[PDB]
Ligand binder design. Structure first.
Ligand SMILES: [Zn+2]
Ligand SMILES: [Zn+2]
Length: 77
């Protein structure tokens, strides 16, 4: 005779954070389509190439084009 309990466990959180550069929340995102950069103005359709997309203006730019960002964010309603 015996018995046990399935047991309930949680913890599906690794890490959460956002980079604030020139009023832009760049978040590592993978663009499934070819998008032209806003700074260098180059086709961002590279295979296995993580880019950056703001949360407000939603501007797509290369990881290296993160420091070359001057334009300010306008924001969306
Ligand atoms: Zn922005
Ligand atoms: Zn770029």
């Amino acid at each position: 005779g015996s018995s046990g309990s399935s047991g309930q466990r949680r913890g599906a959180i690794k890490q959460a954070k956002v980079h604030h550069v020139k009023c832009h929340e760049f978040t590592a995102t993978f663009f499934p389509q070819p998008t032209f950069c806003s700074v260098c103005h180059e086709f961002v359709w590279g295979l296995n190439k993580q880019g950056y997309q703001c949360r407000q203006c939603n501007a797509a730019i290369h990881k290296k084009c993160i420091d070359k960002v001057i334009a300010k964010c306008t924001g969306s309603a």
